[PDB]
Structure 1
């Protein structure tokens, strides 16, 4: 699909058997989700944004369906104000910027 930016580029995703809406974020190296429940193990990690740094849980090889496209990658979970789909996953679903 082609998406214009007059509004937030929100997409529906399916992860850990649950449905959520997430922002397609070209300015995000990583994918960050708000507190939700995920199976398996993780490693502590910290990441930075505007405003400072937040502490997250890191989960590798996680399946995610973004607007019907599957992808497996690292997903971070924590105190983010909004669910974010980062470049690590955008590349897998063939997402591109155009102008």
Structure 2
């Protein structure tokens, strides 16, 4: 799809059999979801944004289907204000900016 930006670029994602709304965020290096359970081992990590740093849980090699397109990669879980799909997965689904 082509997506314009007069509205937030929110999309439905599928992760672990569950449907969620997430924001396509070219300003995010990483993919960060609100608090949820995912299987397998995680590592504690810290990420920084506009308001400072937070602690997250890092899950590697996680399948997410974003708007029909499959990715498998790193998903961070922690106190983000919103579910965000970052560049690590946007690249896997072939997402570019265009103007």
TM bin (shorter chain): over 0.9
Alignment-derived partner of residue 41 in structure 1 = 41
Does the 8 Å contact 1:16/1:37 carry over to 2?
no
Shift of 1:17: 1.3
Q: Separation in 2 of the partners of 1:13 and 1:47? A: 22
Structure 1 runs of 4+ aligned residues shifted over 6 Å read: none
Shift of 1:33: 0.2
Query: Once superposed, what is the RMSD of the aligned Cα atoms?
Result: 0.4
CA-to-partner distance for each residue in 1:11-50, whole Å, 9 max, x for gaps? Answer: 0000011110000000000000000110111000000000
* Count of paired positions: 99
Shift of 1:64: 0.3
Unaligned runs of 5+ in 1: none
Shift of 1:79: 0.4
Does the 8 Å contact 1:9/1:24 carry over to 2?
yes
Q: Separation in 2 of the partners of 1:43 and 1:11? A: 27
Does the 8 Å contact 1:56/1:77 carry over to 2?
yes
Unaligned runs of 5+ in 2: none
Shift of 1:53: 0.4
Shift of 1:89: 0.1
Does the 8 Å contact 1:44/1:57 carry over to 2?
yes
